[PDB]
Every structure is written in C-alpha cells, then in structure tokens.
Amino acid sequence: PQLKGIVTKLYSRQGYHLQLQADGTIDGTKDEDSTYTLFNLIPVGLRVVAIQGVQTKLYLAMNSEGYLYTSELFTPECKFKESVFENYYVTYSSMIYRQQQSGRGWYLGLNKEGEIMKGNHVKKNKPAAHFLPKPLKVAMYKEPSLHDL
C-alpha cells in the first residue's frame, strides 16, 4: 500500500522515448514533451517493477506469445525484472516467459524506427533493450492489487 517508486520517462538507446498512448498503443516518440511518455515505475518485488502509464493508468504487459500490450489490471504478465546494463541503462524482462531452449529472457524493446518489438526478438545485449531512465520525481504508491490471468 505504501511503496516508494519513481515517476520517469524511459529513453530508448535507439533514440525514442517510450510512450503509452490513450488508446493503448505502445511505441516510441520524439515528442519528449508528450504527457504519454510519463510512467510510474512501481516496485512489486526485488528489482521487479510494474510499468504504468501515468496519463492512462494502464500497465505494460507481455503475453505468452511475446507481444507487449496494455493491461487495466495488474497481473503476473505486468511484472518486469529490472536489470542494469553498462552502468547507465536498464533492461526490463518478463518474469514468467522466456526461451524454452536456452532460458534466454524476453525483453521490452524498441527498434530503430521506434516501434515496439516482440519480447522474444529483443536480446539483453542489444541497444533495442536498453533504456536510459529520465526521472521526474520519487513518489509513494499503493501496492497494486494483483489479479490472476
């Protein structure tokens, strides 16, 4: 009910700011000033976060096929493991889905055109998976109510 999180923008190493538009579409934009680039990064576990669009209140999520989508309710598919990369970047990966052969994780990523990619196509060591967080402020959050899939 009282977790300390952060209000922040997520700047893709690919040159685009992550965005969650009112209609639920997820992509990257250069309109840094867009209110749809603001997210609540709420800890829901050890280096596990929920990524919620501030304006829409929607959570980013990844399904079993690797597609990213927006969820009104906080569910297991809304949890992302946060990992630091090359000191300044962070990567976000699914907590429940990964490659059945190597165990390689599925990640949040934007291509060079600033388009959202399938989680299983995004590799941890590639720029597509790297985000430079640009914090606005620290804030307190009610621990999101967890709902089964």
Side-chain angles (χ1 to χ4, degrees), residues 5-31 34-99 102-103 105-125 127-140:
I6 202 162
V7 177
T8 184
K9 295 190 181 183
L10 293 171
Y11 176 71
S12 169
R13 189 173 180 179
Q14 306 269 62
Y16 290 93
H17 287 257
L18 189 64
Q19 165 176 262
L20 173 28
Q21 305 179 59
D23 50 62
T25 50
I26 309 172
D27 72 356
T29 181
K30 294 179 180 175
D31 185 341
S34 177
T35 62
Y36 295 108
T37 59
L38 294 166
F39 295 87
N40 293 312
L41 264 57
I42 309 164
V44 291
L46 286 67
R47 270 296 181 184
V48 178
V49 296
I51 303 172
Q52 177 188 52
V54 174
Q55 206 60 65
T56 60
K57 293 293 187 170
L58 297 161
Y59 297 94
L60 298 186
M62 187 187 296
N63 61 37
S64 63
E65 294 169 65
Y67 291 98
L68 279 67
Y69 67 100
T70 54
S71 184
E72 309 189 341
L73 300 180
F74 175 63
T75 73
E77 291 185 351
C78 297
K79 297 182 177 182
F80 288 87
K81 185 184 99 187
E82 281 191 310
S83 304
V84 297
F85 193 84
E86 273 183 46
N87 303 90
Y88 311 109
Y89 301 107
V90 300
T91 62
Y92 302 94
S93 50
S94 170
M95 284 290 292
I96 60 184
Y97 304 125
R98 60 191 66 76
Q99 292 301 77
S102 65
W106 288 5
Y107 298 70
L108 165 68
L110 293 170
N111 62 25
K112 295 180 180 177
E113 277 293 287
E115 309 178 310
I116 196 62
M117 300 165 67
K118 284 198 65 188
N120 57 112
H121 293 170
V122 178
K123 290 184 177 55
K124 193 210 300 175
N125 60 357
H130 308 157
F131 296 90
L132 176 60
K134 301 189 174 186
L136 174 51
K137 59 175 175 178
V138 176
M140 297 309 281

